[PDB]
Each structure stands twice: as structure tokens, then as C-alpha cells.
Amino acid sequence: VDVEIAKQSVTIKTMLEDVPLPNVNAAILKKVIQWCTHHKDDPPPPEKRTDDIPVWDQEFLKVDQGTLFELILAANYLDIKGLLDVTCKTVANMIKGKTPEEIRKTFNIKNDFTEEEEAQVRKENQWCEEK
Amino acid sequence: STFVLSNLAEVVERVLTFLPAKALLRVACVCRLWRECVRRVLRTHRSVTWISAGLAEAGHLEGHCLVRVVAEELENVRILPHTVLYMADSERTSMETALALEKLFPKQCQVLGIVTPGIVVTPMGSGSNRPQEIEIGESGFALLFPQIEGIKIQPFHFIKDPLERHQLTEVGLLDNPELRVVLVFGYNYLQQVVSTFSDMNIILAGGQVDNLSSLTGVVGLSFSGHRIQSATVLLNEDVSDEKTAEAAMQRLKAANIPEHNTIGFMFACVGRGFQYYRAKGNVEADAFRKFFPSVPLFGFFGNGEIGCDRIVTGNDDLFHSYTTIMALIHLGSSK
């Protein structure tokens, strides 16, 4: 791995100063270095929306749910702020528009509120019903 | 998917950070861990935002600007409103702004906002947009005040009924060990209310308006907080050109107010503006942006101006006309 490419990851950037990655696989590792290669010339990251995600990353992010979520796991493990933020932008973009009646099925979100507390939170957030 | 959006708080918390407000509440009900994460995202909403109705908004057809703009711009807002600040142009005698806005906001949200002949709004998309003196135009912004831990910007609207202490003390104006600034907007009394708190180490922002349009006399906000810092300047007739205006704003900047978590409030005489500035408007706002590139410009043009140039940071004189009140409000930094 290129010295600067590896340095782009905050996690690895430190351990070298003080390359096993027991919590990372070869495929996702290669995906990460590829993303950095596209982002290698990126200006130093100084709205948090998701309509501004890179198109090239989007195509690179046009992967399976398992692939995208393993990428997120790696980025959180590698503290790659740009990569993690772009993947989370995509995930939120998926979530947007969907109400719990759709999100829960979309991500097989095992329910955790009883009907009473469910109504309690809905009334605590009744403004949510407004569009 | 097995362990990503659940059992892993940082990922879900972040992804929610990349959501809007309405969807924030809607997805709050998905999971208890997700509910707590949206609670965190709400507690880190220590900021402000405003809708806008600026460039060529009216056109030949707009379809209820005061309604459509707020409805559409309540989609890319992350801060859960706790108090509403807004404006809109006035142009049988009726009104539906109090209906539209009060319907688009939480049932438990005090509403502030006024209708004035002119309004100052910073264009959206970035806080660095150029403020433009809108003396005439169908427009308006909606400044949303979320719950700011340690900053209770409590409004008030005391009417000129044919003034008891308890009424004022209720809202935190008098007998309040934390007030820092007031927004003295008076529609169609102003003296005594102003006097009730004038003899204090605060900053007095306000003016004279025509009519109010929302709150669940004189209306203002009892900005309370030690982290709050601000200052003001009086751009009187002596400030009537680029040289004088820029000198006055250099004096204002000398206070060294931070530009982070901060708002810019401009109050001016209705005469002050394009006509008063020899067929060239926005001079004061031009200097404002030049010396404060990021701060947004707000307030309004009123028949009266309330404020004395003062500076505060941690630890009849206010009555005048045909002048300006460059008022800057800075909310402090989170932790």
C-alpha cells in the first residue's frame, strides 16, 4: 500500500508512528484504497446533505447492501472521514422519505417499542406527521 | 446490515446527522437506539437557520410565497424549532400567515415573527451570501430557534391594554439574572416597557413595526445566557456614505464579536436605504458583509429604532429616530 494512501486513513496513520488489520478483509481493503485513489487528490476536508455525493463514488457505491455496510464498518474502523460520511450520506438518502412502516421492512428493523410507548413517542413527535 | 445500523451507535448517529428535521422526528420512532441517537442529533442542533424568498421570487405568479416558501424550506432544516422567528411583507383585511406558519410548526412551539414594509434577509445556500436591502418586495425569512442548552430565548408580547410586574417577570425580562439582549419590536407603552429593563447591563435591540402575525404592545425575545455575546452600533445620519458606513462598521468590528453561532441584526429608519443613500441601497449591508463575510443580515426597516451602541462579553437615551441599529447576536460555542 502506498504510504500516503495508508496515511489517508486516520486509524493506520497513527499506529505506524508508534501492517496487520485483523478487523479488515482483502476485498474491502482494496475497495478503501481504490476510494482513496479517487480521493487521493481531494483537497483537505475542511450542510451534511446527501444530494452532493460524488458521482464516481456513487458508482463505486452502487454495490450490494452487505458491500456498502461492510464498507461503512471498515471506514469507521479506519476513521476515513470522507468515506464514512459518503456512505452514511447514501444510507440516509435511502432512509429519507420512508416512514417507519417502510424503513422497518427495508432494513428488517426488529421493533423495540410497545404500542403504548410507540404512541408516546409519536405524540412527543407529532410534528413528524406533517409531511 | 447485521451489525451496522444497529448495535453500532456511531454509524446510526452519524447517518441520522445526515437527515432533515421532519424526517428526523419521523425516523425517531424506528428504534430505541435510533430514538436516543436522534435525541443526540437534536441536542447538537445549537445553530440557527432561515427560509428565504429573495431573488425574483414574486414574479408574475408565486402561489402564496409566505406559505409555499416555508413549506418547501422546512425540508432541508436540521434544527428542531423551539421558537420561531420570521418576517414577511404586508403587500376584508385578513391574514393566513398565522395559519400556515403555526400549522407548519410543532404544536408546542412559541412563534415570533412580524410583517413590515421592508425586511433584511441573507440569501440561503450559504451564510456568506450577499445581504440585500429589501425595502419593497414580497418576501420573508423564517428564523427557527431550537432548544439551545443554556440559552432560553424566551419571547413575549405585552399588549397596550387600557403594566404589572408579574406579567413582565413571567417571561424573564425583569428580575432575570441572565437576560442579555431584547428585540423591541413595537406595532402601532414602548417607553415604560423599555424602561422596565433599560437600567441594566444588556444590549437593547428593537424598533417600530406595523402589525404582528404570530405568537401563542411590543414583542421581543429575552435572550438569556452567559455564553451569549454581542454588541451594537448607531449608524446615525453621520453614516450616510461608503466612507462613513465602512468606518462605523470597522468600529463595530472592533468589538471583536465571534462569527461562530452568530446572527446579524440590522434595524434602520424606514427612510434609511436606497433613497436615503443617493440612489444606491445596501451600503450598510455592503459594509456589513465586507467586514462580516459569514454573518447573516436580519432585522427590518422601521419608523423607529431602539438601541445604544454597547458591548458585553461574559463579565430616553435608547429612544431615537432616523438612525440605524447595527445589532449582532452571537450565541456562543457548544462543547
UniProtKB/Swiss-Prot annotation, chain A:
Gene3D superfamilies: Potassium Channel Kv1.1, Chain A
Record-listed Phosphothreonine modification sites: T99
Keywords: Host-virus interaction, Isopeptide bond, Phosphoprotein, Ubl conjugation, Ubl conjugation pathway
Region listing for Disordered, in residue ranges: 37-51
GO molecular function: beta-catenin binding; cullin family protein binding; F-box domain binding; molecular function activator activity; protein domain specific binding; ubiquitin ligase complex scaffold activity; ubiquitin-like ligase-substrate adaptor activity
Post-translational modification: Undergoes autophagy-mediated degradation in the liver in a time-dependent manner.
Residue ranges of the region described as Interaction with the F-box domain of F-box proteins: 72-131
GO CC terms, sorted: centrosome; Cul7-RING ubiquitin ligase complex; cytoplasm; cytosol; nucleoplasm; nucleus; PcG protein complex; SCF ubiquitin ligase complex
Role played: Essential component of the SCF (SKP1-CUL1-F-box protein) ubiquitin ligase complex, which mediates the ubiquitination of proteins involved in cell cycle progression, signal transduction and transcription. In the SCF complex, serves as an adapter that links the F-box protein to CUL1. The functional specificity of the SCF complex depends on the F-box protein as substrate recognition component. SCF(BTRC) and SCF(FBXW11) direct ubiquitination of CTNNB1 and participate in Wnt signaling. SCF(FBXW11) directs ubiquitination of phosphorylated NFKBIA.
The protein's assembly and partners: Interacts with KDM2B, forming heterodimers. The KDM2B-SKP1 heterodimeric complex interacts with the PCGF1-BCORL heterodimeric complex to form a homotetrameric polycomb repression complex 1 (PRC1.1). Component of multiple SCF (SKP1-CUL1-F-box) E3 ubiquitin-protein ligase complexes formed of CUL1, SKP1, RBX1 and a variable F-box domain-containing protein as substrate-specific subunit. Component of the SCF(FBXW11) complex containing FBXW11. Component of the SCF(SKP2) complex containing SKP2, in which it interacts directly with SKP1, SKP2 and RBX1.
Name assigned to this protein: S-phase kinase-associated protein 1
Gene: SKP1
Curated annotation (Swiss-Prot), chain B:
Signal peptide stretch: none
SMART domains listed in its UniProt record: FIST_C
Domain called F-box: residue spans: 3-49
Keywords for this protein: Acetylation, Cytoplasm, Nucleus, Phosphoprotein, Ubl conjugation pathway
Tissue: Predominantly expressed in liver, also enriched in cardiac muscle.
Keyword Magnesium on entry: no
GO annotation, biological process: cellular response to starvation; nucleocytoplasmic transport; positive regulation of proteasomal ubiquitin-dependent protein catabolic process; proteasome-mediated ubiquitin-dependent protein catabolic process; protein modification process; protein polyubiquitination; regulation of skeletal muscle fiber development; ubiquitin-dependent protein catabolic process
Organism superkingdom: Eukaryota
PTM characteristics: Phosphorylated by EIF2AK4 at Thr-93 causes cytoplasmic retention of FBXO22.
Stated consequence of mutating T93A: Loss of EIF2AK4-induced cytoplasmic retention of FBXO22
Residues that bear N6-acetyllysine: K160
Phosphoserine, modified sites: S94
Residue positions, PTM Phosphothreonine: T93
InterPro entries: F-box-like_dom_sf, F-box_dom, FIST_C
A Gene Ontology term for the protein's cellular component: Z disc
GO molecular function, one term: ubiquitin-protein transferase activity
Compartment(s) where it occurs, according to its Swiss-Prot or TrEMBL record: Cytoplasm; Nucleus; Cytoplasm, Myofibril, Sarcomere, Z line
Subunit structure: Directly interacts with SKP1 and CUL1. Interacts (via C-terminal) with KDM4A. Interacts with TP53. Interacts with MTOR; this interaction promotes 'lys-27'-linked ubiquitination of MTOR. (Microbial infection) Interacts with SARS_COV-2 protein NSP5; this interaction attenuates NSP5-mediated inhibition of innate immunity.
Function description: Substrate-recognition component of the SCF (SKP1-CUL1-F-box protein)-type E3 ubiquitin ligase complex that is implicated in the control of various cellular processes such as cell cycle control, transcriptional regulation, DNA damage repair, and apoptosis. Promotes the proteasome-dependent degradation of key sarcomeric proteins, such as alpha-actinin (ACTN2) and filamin-C (FLNC), essential for maintenance of normal contractile function. Acts as a key regulator of histone methylation marks namely H3K9 and H3K36 methylation through the regulation of histone demethylase KDM4A protein levels.
Protein name listed in UniProt: F-box only protein 22
Species of the source: Homo sapiens (Human)
Protein's gene: FBXO22
